[PDB]
Scaffold this active site. Sequence first.
Site, PDB file in Angstrom:
ATOM      1  N   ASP A 159      47.029 -30.255   1.078  1.00  0.00           N
ATOM      2  CA  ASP A 159      46.248 -31.120   0.211  1.00  0.00           C
ATOM      3  C   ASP A 159      46.436 -30.829  -1.259  1.00  0.00           C
ATOM      4  N   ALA A 182      43.520 -36.694   0.534  1.00  0.00           N
ATOM      5  CA  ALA A 182      42.211 -36.354  -0.023  1.00  0.00           C
ATOM      6  C   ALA A 182      41.770 -34.970   0.478  1.00  0.00           C
ATOM      7  N   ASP A 184      39.582 -32.521   2.485  1.00  0.00           N
ATOM      8  CA  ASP A 184      38.906 -32.693   3.778  1.00  0.00           C
ATOM      9  C   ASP A 184      37.383 -32.742   3.666  1.00  0.00           C
ATOM     10  N   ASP A 195      36.877 -27.582  -0.298  1.00  0.00           N
ATOM     11  CA  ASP A 195      38.099 -27.511   0.538  1.00  0.00           C
ATOM     12  C   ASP A 195      39.121 -26.539  -0.096  1.00  0.00           C
ATOM     13  N   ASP A 201      46.693 -25.347   0.163  1.00  0.00           N
ATOM     14  CA  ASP A 201      45.602 -25.689   1.047  1.00  0.00           C
ATOM     15  C   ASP A 201      46.051 -26.589   2.194  1.00  0.00           C
ATOM     16  N   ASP A 203      46.116 -29.323   5.023  1.00  0.00           N
ATOM     17  CA  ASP A 203      45.555 -30.661   5.218  1.00  0.00           C
ATOM     18  C   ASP A 203      45.104 -30.828   6.669  1.00  0.00           C
ATOM     19  N   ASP A 205      43.402 -33.148   7.899  1.00  0.00           N
ATOM     20  CA  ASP A 205      43.503 -34.563   8.289  1.00  0.00           C
ATOM     21  C   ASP A 205      44.881 -34.885   8.948  1.00  0.00           C
ATOM     22  N   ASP A 232      38.316 -16.823   9.587  1.00  0.00           N
ATOM     23  CA  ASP A 232      38.266 -16.660   8.125  1.00  0.00           C
ATOM     24  C   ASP A 232      37.904 -17.930   7.383  1.00  0.00           C
ATOM     25  N   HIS A 236      35.589 -23.622   3.801  1.00  0.00           N
ATOM     26  CA  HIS A 236      36.717 -24.318   3.151  1.00  0.00           C
ATOM     27  C   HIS A 236      37.577 -25.077   4.167  1.00  0.00           C
ATOM     28  N   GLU A 262      33.203 -16.432   9.466  1.00  0.00           N
ATOM     29  CA  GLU A 262      32.779 -16.019   8.124  1.00  0.00           C
ATOM     30  C   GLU A 262      32.448 -17.222   7.253  1.00  0.00           C
TER      31      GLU A 262
HETATM   32  C1  LIG Z   1      36.631 -13.361  -0.895  1.00  0.00           C
HETATM   33  C2  LIG Z   1      35.863 -14.595  -0.351  1.00  0.00           C
HETATM   34  O1  LIG Z   1      36.052 -15.705  -1.257  1.00  0.00           O
HETATM   35  C3  LIG Z   1      35.212 -16.840  -1.063  1.00  0.00           C
HETATM   36  O2  LIG Z   1      33.805 -16.534  -1.278  1.00  0.00           O
HETATM   37  C4  LIG Z   1      33.298 -17.139  -2.453  1.00  0.00           C
HETATM   38  C5  LIG Z   1      32.099 -17.995  -2.045  1.00  0.00           C
HETATM   39  O3  LIG Z   1      32.408 -19.017  -1.106  1.00  0.00           O
HETATM   40  C6  LIG Z   1      31.398 -18.522  -3.303  1.00  0.00           C
HETATM   41  O4  LIG Z   1      30.268 -19.260  -2.950  1.00  0.00           O
HETATM   42  C7  LIG Z   1      30.929 -17.316  -4.132  1.00  0.00           C
HETATM   43  O5  LIG Z   1      30.030 -16.504  -3.331  1.00  0.00           O
HETATM   44  C8  LIG Z   1      28.701 -16.430  -3.819  1.00  0.00           C
HETATM   45  C9  LIG Z   1      27.776 -16.939  -2.701  1.00  0.00           C
HETATM   46  O6  LIG Z   1      27.936 -18.325  -2.497  1.00  0.00           O
HETATM   47  C10 LIG Z   1      26.313 -16.685  -3.032  1.00  0.00           C
HETATM   48  O7  LIG Z   1      25.510 -17.237  -1.992  1.00  0.00           O
HETATM   49  C11 LIG Z   1      26.105 -15.186  -3.318  1.00  0.00           C
HETATM   50  O8  LIG Z   1      24.769 -14.971  -3.718  1.00  0.00           O
HETATM   51  O9  LIG Z   1      26.948 -14.738  -4.381  1.00  0.00           O
HETATM   52  C12 LIG Z   1      28.352 -14.988  -4.247  1.00  0.00           C
HETATM   53  C13 LIG Z   1      29.011 -14.640  -5.576  1.00  0.00           C
HETATM   54  O10 LIG Z   1      29.827 -13.504  -5.366  1.00  0.00           O
HETATM   55  O11 LIG Z   1      32.077 -16.580  -4.534  1.00  0.00           O
HETATM   56  C14 LIG Z   1      32.833 -16.033  -3.445  1.00  0.00           C
HETATM   57  C15 LIG Z   1      33.982 -15.202  -4.024  1.00  0.00           C
HETATM   58  O12 LIG Z   1      34.721 -16.060  -4.861  1.00  0.00           O
HETATM   59  C16 LIG Z   1      35.399 -17.429   0.358  1.00  0.00           C
HETATM   60  O13 LIG Z   1      34.321 -18.304   0.601  1.00  0.00           O
HETATM   61  C17 LIG Z   1      35.356 -16.312   1.413  1.00  0.00           C
HETATM   62  O14 LIG Z   1      35.666 -16.919   2.633  1.00  0.00           O
HETATM   63  C18 LIG Z   1      36.291 -15.122   1.055  1.00  0.00           C
HETATM   64  N1  LIG Z   1      36.462 -14.076   2.123  1.00  0.00           N
HETATM   65  C19 LIG Z   1      37.485 -14.295   3.190  1.00  0.00           C
HETATM   66  C20 LIG Z   1      38.584 -15.156   2.609  1.00  0.00           C
HETATM   67  C21 LIG Z   1      39.777 -14.663   2.186  1.00  0.00           C
HETATM   68  C22 LIG Z   1      40.976 -15.574   2.027  1.00  0.00           C
HETATM   69  O15 LIG Z   1      41.681 -15.511   3.249  1.00  0.00           O
HETATM   70  C23 LIG Z   1      40.011 -13.182   1.919  1.00  0.00           C
HETATM   71  O16 LIG Z   1      40.293 -13.000   0.543  1.00  0.00           O
HETATM   72  C24 LIG Z   1      40.983 -11.814   0.151  1.00  0.00           C
HETATM   73  O17 LIG Z   1      42.389 -12.029   0.140  1.00  0.00           O
HETATM   74  C25 LIG Z   1      42.847 -12.958  -0.841  1.00  0.00           C
HETATM   75  C26 LIG Z   1      44.343 -13.229  -0.648  1.00  0.00           C
HETATM   76  O18 LIG Z   1      45.007 -12.015  -0.866  1.00  0.00           O
HETATM   77  C27 LIG Z   1      42.415 -12.574  -2.282  1.00  0.00           C
HETATM   78  O19 LIG Z   1      42.683 -13.692  -3.112  1.00  0.00           O
HETATM   79  C28 LIG Z   1      43.011 -13.357  -4.490  1.00  0.00           C
HETATM   80  O20 LIG Z   1      44.367 -12.934  -4.656  1.00  0.00           O
HETATM   81  C29 LIG Z   1      45.380 -13.926  -4.413  1.00  0.00           C
HETATM   82  C30 LIG Z   1      46.806 -13.353  -4.537  1.00  0.00           C
HETATM   83  O21 LIG Z   1      47.003 -12.824  -5.835  1.00  0.00           O
HETATM   84  C31 LIG Z   1      45.129 -15.129  -5.345  1.00  0.00           C
HETATM   85  O22 LIG Z   1      46.157 -16.081  -5.187  1.00  0.00           O
HETATM   86  C32 LIG Z   1      46.486 -16.764  -6.433  1.00  0.00           C
HETATM   87  O23 LIG Z   1      47.658 -16.261  -7.095  1.00  0.00           O
HETATM   88  C33 LIG Z   1      48.844 -16.388  -6.343  1.00  0.00           C
HETATM   89  C34 LIG Z   1      49.909 -15.574  -7.066  1.00  0.00           C
HETATM   90  O24 LIG Z   1      49.749 -14.249  -6.583  1.00  0.00           O
HETATM   91  C35 LIG Z   1      49.177 -17.868  -6.099  1.00  0.00           C
HETATM   92  O25 LIG Z   1      50.288 -17.968  -5.218  1.00  0.00           O
HETATM   93  C36 LIG Z   1      51.203 -19.033  -5.588  1.00  0.00           C
HETATM   94  O26 LIG Z   1      52.062 -18.649  -6.659  1.00  0.00           O
HETATM   95  C37 LIG Z   1      52.945 -17.524  -6.424  1.00  0.00           C
HETATM   96  C38 LIG Z   1      53.714 -17.219  -7.734  1.00  0.00           C
HETATM   97  C39 LIG Z   1      53.846 -17.863  -5.207  1.00  0.00           C
HETATM   98  N2  LIG Z   1      54.876 -16.845  -4.946  1.00  0.00           N
HETATM   99  C40 LIG Z   1      56.317 -17.160  -5.094  1.00  0.00           C
HETATM  100  C41 LIG Z   1      56.949 -16.340  -6.201  1.00  0.00           C
HETATM  101  C42 LIG Z   1      57.896 -15.382  -6.010  1.00  0.00           C
HETATM  102  C43 LIG Z   1      58.831 -14.965  -7.130  1.00  0.00           C
HETATM  103  O27 LIG Z   1      59.435 -16.112  -7.736  1.00  0.00           O
HETATM  104  C44 LIG Z   1      58.071 -14.692  -4.661  1.00  0.00           C
HETATM  105  O28 LIG Z   1      57.597 -13.356  -4.786  1.00  0.00           O
HETATM  106  C45 LIG Z   1      57.306 -15.400  -3.483  1.00  0.00           C
HETATM  107  O29 LIG Z   1      57.906 -15.168  -2.211  1.00  0.00           O
HETATM  108  C46 LIG Z   1      57.078 -16.920  -3.758  1.00  0.00           C
HETATM  109  O30 LIG Z   1      56.473 -17.618  -2.695  1.00  0.00           O
HETATM  110  C47 LIG Z   1      53.003 -18.296  -3.974  1.00  0.00           C
HETATM  111  O31 LIG Z   1      53.833 -18.757  -2.942  1.00  0.00           O
HETATM  112  C48 LIG Z   1      52.059 -19.456  -4.363  1.00  0.00           C
HETATM  113  O32 LIG Z   1      51.288 -19.921  -3.258  1.00  0.00           O
HETATM  114  C49 LIG Z   1      47.989 -18.539  -5.403  1.00  0.00           C
HETATM  115  O33 LIG Z   1      48.292 -19.914  -5.237  1.00  0.00           O
HETATM  116  C50 LIG Z   1      46.676 -18.271  -6.184  1.00  0.00           C
HETATM  117  O34 LIG Z   1      45.541 -18.843  -5.559  1.00  0.00           O
HETATM  118  C51 LIG Z   1      43.715 -15.682  -5.067  1.00  0.00           C
HETATM  119  O35 LIG Z   1      43.352 -16.810  -5.839  1.00  0.00           O
HETATM  120  C52 LIG Z   1      42.697 -14.584  -5.344  1.00  0.00           C
HETATM  121  O36 LIG Z   1      41.436 -15.150  -5.042  1.00  0.00           O
HETATM  122  C53 LIG Z   1      40.901 -12.301  -2.336  1.00  0.00           C
HETATM  123  O37 LIG Z   1      40.484 -11.873  -3.626  1.00  0.00           O
HETATM  124  C54 LIG Z   1      40.486 -11.330  -1.230  1.00  0.00           C
HETATM  125  O38 LIG Z   1      39.098 -11.137  -1.218  1.00  0.00           O
HETATM  126  C55 LIG Z   1      38.774 -12.322   2.313  1.00  0.00           C
HETATM  127  O39 LIG Z   1      39.135 -10.974   2.441  1.00  0.00           O
HETATM  128  C56 LIG Z   1      38.135 -12.938   3.586  1.00  0.00           C
HETATM  129  O40 LIG Z   1      37.209 -12.093   4.225  1.00  0.00           O
HETATM  130 CA   LIG Z   2      40.673 -25.840   2.750  1.00  0.00          CA
HETATM  131 CA   LIG Z   3      43.112 -33.746   3.516  1.00  0.00          CA
HETATM  132 NA    NA Z   4      42.411 -29.417   3.009  1.00  0.00          NA
END
Ligand SMILES: C[C@H]1O[C@H](O[C@H]2[C@H](O)[C@@H](O)[C@@H](O[C@H]3[C@H](O)[C@@H](O)[C@H](O)O[C@@H]3CO)O[C@@H]2CO)[C@H](O)[C@@H](O)[C@@H]1N[C@H]1C=C(CO)[C@@H](O[C@H]2O[C@H](CO)[C@@H](O[C@H]3O[C@H](CO)[C@@H](O[C@H]4O[C@H](CO)[C@@H](O[C@H]5O[C@H](C)[C@@H](N[C@H]6C=C(CO)[C@@H](O)[C@H](O)[C@H]6O)[C@H](O)[C@H]5O)[C@H](O)[C@H]4O)[C@H](O)[C@H]3O)[C@H](O)[C@H]2O)[C@H](O)[C@H]1O
Ligand SMILES: [Ca+2]
Ligand SMILES: [Ca+2]
Ligand code: NA
Length: 481
Positions: A159, A182, A184, A195, A201, A203, A205, A232, A236, A262
């Site tokens: 998406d 769009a 989801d 989403d 992200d 899709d 749909d 996980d 979203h 979760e």
């Molecule tokens: C952690 C938790 O998050 C969410 O929770 C939210 C919540 O929903 C929200 O409401 C609020 O919470 C509040 C409550 O609502 C209230 O009620 C309460 O009172 O207070 C709260 C306030 O604290 O806030 C919360 C936190 O924000 C979500 O809902 C939960 O479900 C979630 N927990 C679970 C979910 C997880 C995800 O699976 C997991 O998270 C882990 O792991 C994550 C992934 O590692 C990590 O994410 C962080 O780090 C990422 C990696 O750095 C980052 O990604 C960004 O940057 C990337 C670059 O590194 C981008 O990648 C793209 O670009 C690169 C360049 C590409 N690479 C290329 C390049 C190359 C060289 O040329 C090569 O090397 C490669 O081979 C190439 O491919 C890549 O391909 C591209 O795709 C990427 O796009 C970017 O997004 C993340 O953004 C960053 O967030 C988490 O931090 C960590 O916790 C949990 O563990 C699991 O339990």
């Molecule tokens: Ca999603």
């Molecule tokens: Ca969609």
């Molecule tokens: Na989606």
Amino acid sequence: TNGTMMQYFEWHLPNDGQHWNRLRDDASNLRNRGITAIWIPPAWKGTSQNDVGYGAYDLYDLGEFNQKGTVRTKYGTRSQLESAIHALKNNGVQVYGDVVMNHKGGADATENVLAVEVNPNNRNQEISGDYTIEAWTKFDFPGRGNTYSDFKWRWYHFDGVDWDQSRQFQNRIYKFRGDGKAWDWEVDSENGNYDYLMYADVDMDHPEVVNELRRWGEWYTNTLNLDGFRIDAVKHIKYSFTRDWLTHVRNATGKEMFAVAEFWKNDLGALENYLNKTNWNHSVFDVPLHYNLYNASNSGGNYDMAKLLNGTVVQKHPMHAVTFVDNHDSQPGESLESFVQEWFKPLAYALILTREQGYPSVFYGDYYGIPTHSVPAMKAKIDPILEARQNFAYGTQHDYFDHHNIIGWTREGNTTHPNSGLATIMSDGPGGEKWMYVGQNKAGQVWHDITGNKPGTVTINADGWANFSVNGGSVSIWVKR
Ligand SMILES: C[C@H]1O[C@H](O[C@H]2[C@H](O)[C@@H](O)[C@@H](O[C@H]3[C@H](O)[C@@H](O)[C@H](O)O[C@@H]3CO)O[C@@H]2CO)[C@H](O)[C@@H](O)[C@@H]1N[C@H]1C=C(CO)[C@@H](O[C@H]2O[C@H](CO)[C@@H](O[C@H]3O[C@H](CO)[C@@H](O[C@H]4O[C@H](CO)[C@@H](O[C@H]5O[C@H](C)[C@@H](N[C@H]6C=C(CO)[C@@H](O)[C@H](O)[C@H]6O)[C@H](O)[C@H]5O)[C@H](O)[C@H]4O)[C@H](O)[C@H]3O)[C@H](O)[C@H]2O)[C@H](O)[C@H]1O
Ligand SMILES: [Ca+2]
Ligand SMILES: [Ca+2]
Ligand code: NA
Ligand SMILES: [Ca+2]
């Protein structure tokens, strides 16, 4: 016998490929301490070797293909995982797999895609004209080829993304253009539509995606002989998709598959909506109870302990609550950092381990420590509580949530499990005593504190009552000596 889950990882485990081996060696030990089910970390290949696994690159690569610069995952190789699971199964312990379907990271190449920007604080609002971005959406899995699956991912399976490789701006979210593209629905409504989280992200749909994920689900379950899942990031992911995915996998495998989702939101209303929309067909983590415990642990004795369960999933829907104290996201320095303070931690564990409601989960970081930050192993303090759950925490429960410091509950025991029955008493403030009922049939028995916090004994009176006591800022768990 009482079920107990352990989360068998923390964020900062070393990248030494030894984790599956550690689990194999621990299998007898966990069984003996009363652990009946293990939740293993993401088993598949992430964006690199040191990825915890939530940057989910290839769900069919369990540390067996040369991709992302490594054969093994962070934790070890596929054969190492498979012998750990055998060790667990031989010891009567169940295995739950993590499940990451929201997003895919680490694409093999970029594609040029027509997209529009949306407002990060309101993803329903388009804030630019359409234009072409360079998006990381192409996955060919060069190390694996077509083994187990010939499905390739392309921009149209997604998406949106938060990264344009050609311009490299921060704080942007890009929604893809295209027929029927769009966000989801239904998903959580924080930020308008939640989403989009990170990476590319999925899709939900798209009918090829739905089919691929269902089929991956059977394969994962069968390849590893899993007994259930931890799912996980469900806020979203389109709610009806999660509901029907789980039903599909249960139907296709013939197994009951326990699942806990979760849904991270400190809001009992949002959690009830989710449970209604998924037809009550799985459990959720009790996130409100985690925040109650966290706040109580920071209040210096001033929290009102009579209100510790108010607003929680376990209070209202006990058969759908998985209770926990801390996890890999609430641990120090992490994304949802809200770590329960060390002095309160044995109280929090007594609460989830010795009451009849909810399905409790022990955190690896608490049990074995988090040496990278300064968190000591609390094995010595948690073990006697696990023994109380395993051998004593049975029968009719009587609750005494009737004071702002000193609260307790008793269990009468049952005839299966001899010598079972207990009185838990705790205080977040000064020490003291409480009169509590353990059962008329326990008259004349002599009881001791299994934690060893309170020395001495307590004799149960002719009517089944006793004055149980506890030190300040402490828990005592009284059982037949
Ligand atoms: C952690 C938790 O998050 C969410 O929770 C939210 C919540 O929903 C929200 O409401 C609020 O919470 C509040 C409550 O609502 C209230 O009620 C309460 O009172 O207070 C709260 C306030 O604290 O806030 C919360 C936190 O924000 C979500 O809902 C939960 O479900 C979630 N927990 C679970 C979910 C997880 C995800 O699976 C997991 O998270 C882990 O792991 C994550 C992934 O590692 C990590 O994410 C962080 O780090 C990422 C990696 O750095 C980052 O990604 C960004 O940057 C990337 C670059 O590194 C981008 O990648 C793209 O670009 C690169 C360049 C590409 N690479 C290329 C390049 C190359 C060289 O040329 C090569 O090397 C490669 O081979 C190439 O491919 C890549 O391909 C591209 O795709 C990427 O796009 C970017 O997004 C993340 O953004 C960053 O967030 C988490 O931090 C960590 O916790 C949990 O563990 C699991 O339990
Ligand atoms: Ca999603
Ligand atoms: Ca969609
Ligand atoms: Na989606
Ligand atoms: Ca208090």
